[PDB]
Amino acid sequence: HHHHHSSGSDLGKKLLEAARAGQDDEVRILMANGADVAAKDKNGSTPLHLAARNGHLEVVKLLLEAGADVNAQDKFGKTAFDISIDNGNEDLAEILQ
Template identity: 45%
Template sequence: MVRVMASLFTLVGFVGALSGAAAIAQTPPAPAELSAYRGLHAAAARGSDEDIRRLAQAGADLNTRDGNGRTPLHVAAFQGHGAAARVLISLGADPALLDNQRYDAVTIAAVRDDVPTLKALLAAGASAKLVTSVYDGTALIAAAHLGHDGIVRELIRAGAPLDHVNNLGWTALIEAVVLGDGGHRHTQTVRVLLEAGADPRISDRNGATPLQLAQARGYTGMVSLLQRPLPR
């Protein structure tokens, strides 16, 4: 118990720093990059299905990369062009490729809280199960961290692993607590994860459970959810 309490007290400063870093972990194309794009990157940035098809038919590399390792599919996801993303995948673009920050298109859409683009990617065959980011996480963990409860629902429907543990020792459920603000959307995220079967008994590396972490932060809505008996 002493170790758990020490974990709870020392976690706050670390989490504050991590939250700020995570918010800028992805690198969307800057305006200068967007204006300099040519070929498929430019077509993806505009969301032009017609130009994507024309360039693909002319032999353009669907998985070509820009200076940050972004493919046209990454660019389409960053720009919120779900229809263009579906066309790219249908023509052979690889949805499992990661950019230089180790993000795939699904995680990009998840972080952007872009449900329509996420749905388009998943419908086209992109996976919700990839391990992404420097934290060896998943799109579900990223969405839970940010309290994107609608995204969390879609990823769970697509088979995202509920109890994946990243290299910080955290699951999606733990991240919703320790990187959340205790507000409505993070609390709904905890609810959705629990209803889907996420395991609240998985603790962090110091033995603190999601319930203990929520109690330490005074997140009463989460505490109420986490105190419910597990289904038999």
């Protein structure tokens, strides 16, 4: 279907933003400081979803290594992989395979 991108308080909100923005160092620091990789925004998107929506491969790898649920589903029932398929980013899909 149509593409899903994301360029249009606590540590959770900051991690959601770092992931959405592809800022790996921010993501490392925030998770080290207890930011929850399971944090969710309004649309039920986790940091893994926002990184995926914007094609940030490095952030996706860091989140997965930190133990993020690769199969978490947003409010639409989509996983990061589904997002990569909808957006047509095969580089990302291969990483979430």
